[PDB]
């Protein structure tokens, strides 16, 4: 009865690009985190501020499940205090993070012959992202002293870039799917608990 729809997020058909990372609210359900931590289909399963074993016996105000797709090595950037293109311009976790980062290889689902160009990442931004910020603007980034005048050109580039997931790519450049579970505890009724 009234379990939490984790299957909706993990087993989703299509995943949003990292720059437009899709957040799902989790409230008013019982959470069986076992389904996650008892599975071995995961490439990286790291948790900050809480243990996955001690999850089923905890209550929180709200739980957010952010989901997106990045490349193999860039998975490192989904962790508190990290730098890089993804962590600065796409998806930044707070230094005082209390959650779990779960990522797994999805080369079969996300890549195709001639490369898949449906997955983007933001390469340029005027400033680094605040934690849990989303910038989907497509303003031509002004890299030099030239005005750019809303048209790409000399020192004027499109802010987003295509990943280009070839099936023949190395493990480091293969598409991985990431889900970030954030467990916020405010001065509110704890509406999410386990057994």
């Amino acid at each position: 009865t009234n379990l939490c729809p984790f299957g909706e997020v993990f087993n989703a058909t299509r995943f949003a690009s990292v720059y437009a990372w899709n957040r799902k609210r989790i409230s008013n359900c019982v959470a069986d985190y076992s389904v996650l931590y008892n599975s071995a289909s995961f490439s990286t399963f790291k948790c900050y501020g809480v243990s996955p074993t001690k999850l089923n016996d905890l209550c929180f105000t709200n739980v957010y499940a952010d989901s997106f797709v990045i490349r193999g090595d860039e998975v490192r950037q989904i962790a508190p205090g990290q730098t890089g293109k993804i962590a600065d311009y796409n998806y930044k976790l707070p230094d005082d993070f209390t959650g779990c980062v779960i990522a797994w290889n999805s080369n079969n689902l996300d890549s195709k012959v001639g490369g898949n160009y449906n997955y983007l990442y933001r390469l340029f931004r005027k400033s680094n992202l605040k934690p849990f910020e989303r910038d989907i603007s497509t303003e031509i980034y002004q890299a030099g002293s030239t005005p750019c005048n809303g048209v790409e050109g000399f020192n004027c580039y499109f802010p987003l870039q295509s990943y280009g997931f070839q099936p023949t790519n190395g493990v480091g450049y293969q598409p991985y799917r990431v889900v970030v579970l954030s467990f916020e505890l405010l001065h509110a009724p704890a509406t999410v608990c386990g057994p």
Partner: antibody, heavy 129, light 108 residues
């Protein structure tokens, strides 16, 4: 931008004490461990200890046990390291270093990640008459 | 106390040469090894962590591998700005220790 600013270089007479400061800026201070690393002129790097910015728990190396003291102030987001009973071997540059956060395994195993991403500029301590 | 030996202690290679350094541990540390690139006067700069993972912002020409007691650090094509002293570090068991260092120079 993350920044570790250490105190000025000092000269101290043998047997005295030095206190070196490391001020963290550009990240939540109470969410990472701070480690100290000393490097003698011309020699290699040598580990000194770890301090917990949150609770203040401290673990020093056996070589410095009883002579090194690590202090922390949350309000100013700074870490102090004091070495007493200085000798000619202690003339070196002292770095603070921040590693990333230690994470939990899928199984629930505490996995330490003690690689140093951010370093201070270094504090030279010259021990001389 | 885990001892680390670095081979060699010094070396000189030409521009574009492939460079390889070895770090041997007195005990088994699975891959809890890191590589730092300390330039003269500056602080150490982390290039490789977990003995095989490239740190965000490091050129593709750098690599590391190894396990158990033996690790290797490799530079594909030696670029002029790569001149520094390279150290290895372990964190499998306290206390942390560093290698002897490998002063790398350019043949010009």
């Amino acid at each position: 931008q993350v920044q570790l600013v250490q105190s000025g270089a000092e000269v101290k007479k043998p047997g005295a004490s030095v206190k070196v400061s490391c001020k963290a800026s550009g990240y939540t201070f109470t969410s990472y461990y701070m480690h100290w690393v000393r490097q003698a002129p011309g020699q290699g790097l040598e580990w000194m200890g770890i301090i917990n910015s949150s609770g203040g728990s401290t673990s020093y190396a056996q070589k410095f046990q009883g002579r090194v003291t690590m202090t922390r102030d949350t309000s100013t987001s700074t870490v102090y390291m004091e070495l007493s009973s200085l000798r000619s071997e202690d003339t070196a540059v002292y770095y603070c270093a921040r590693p990333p956060r230690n994470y939990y395994d899928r199984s629930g195993y505490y996995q330490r990640a003690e690689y140093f991403q951010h370093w201070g500029q270094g504090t030279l301590v010259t021990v001389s008459s | 106390d885990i001892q680390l030996t670095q081979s060699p202690s010094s070396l000189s290679a030409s521009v574009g040469d492939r460079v390889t350094i070895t770090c041997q541990a007195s005990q088994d540390i699975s891959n809890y090894l890191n590589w730092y690139q300390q330039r003269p006067g500056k602080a150490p700069k982390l290039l490789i962590y977990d003995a095989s993972n490239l740190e965000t912002g490091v050129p593709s020409r750098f690599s590391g591998s190894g396990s158990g007691t033996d690790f290797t650090f490799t530079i594909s094509s030696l670029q002029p700005e790569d001149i520094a002293t390279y150290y290895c570090q372990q964190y499998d068991n306290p206390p942390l220790t560093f290698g002897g260092g490998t002063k790398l120079e350019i043949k010009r």
